[PDB]
Write a protein that binds this ligand. Sequence first.
Ligand SMILES: Cc1ccc(NC(=O)c2ccc(CN3CCN(C)CC3)cc2)cc1Nc1nccc(-c2cccnc2)n1
Length: 244
Amino acid sequence: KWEIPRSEITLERKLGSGQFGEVYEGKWRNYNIEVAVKTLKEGTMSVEEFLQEAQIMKKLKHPNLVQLYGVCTKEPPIYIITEYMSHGSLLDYLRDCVNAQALLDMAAQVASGMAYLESQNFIHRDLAARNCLVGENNVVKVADFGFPIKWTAPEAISYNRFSIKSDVWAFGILLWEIFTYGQVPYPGMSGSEVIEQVERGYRMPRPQGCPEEIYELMLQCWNKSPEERPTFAETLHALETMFL
Ligand SMILES: Cc1ccc(NC(=O)c2ccc(CN3CCN(C)CC3)cc2)cc1Nc1nccc(-c2cccnc2)n1
């Protein structure tokens, strides 16, 4: 049902690479549309486990989550195909320097996609600006491509206790990357310093020009106790109800 015949897809550019496979921009000849194409490097893992990513994705449908288009699974190399986002990663897009209202809009869209995931009983586990994509009209979508200490909540580092609340922690960090135009967090600090300082109560200070109301939401995301962090639903309402 999600099988696409392989001849319909034409590869055009290497986007990124790795150890389980690579990703390309391609063209889908039928729809006259650009696609992203993720490939299985044979023998780096099973075909079955590669396609478990596509299985999850068939259950999810939301304007701020990357849409699966289909798979090519009849022979190697196995493909998972999604929409292509014209402006690439949020992080790269922020790094070209917009208004605080537009930065807010982008944050809301991520929260929106996360809220949907939460509602469907999934966790991300790797939320970060590098993992969100930008299209036209400032549309933002959450993706997962795919340490990393600086995005990972304390209980996750210490007890391997990942949860939707550890995701809320990472969204606080992402909020900070957004409102700094994509700076690397905890500037200068190494990982072990970050783990130690954070444990003792350290939080990044408010970025230059960032609204206090926005900064206050980041602090709520970074509560030391996970049960006291806001839900993603709560988080979206908070963002929509900031004005100016
Ligand atoms: C080609 C592909 C294959 C798979 C995916 N997968 C996902 O984006 C994804 C998102 C959410 C989940 C759900 N979630 C994962 C976390 N776990 C714990 C459970 C639930 C799963 C996969 C995206 C894509 N798209 C993709 N991948 C890399 C780069 C790009 C890309 C780059 C530049 C411009 N446009 C697109 N696009």
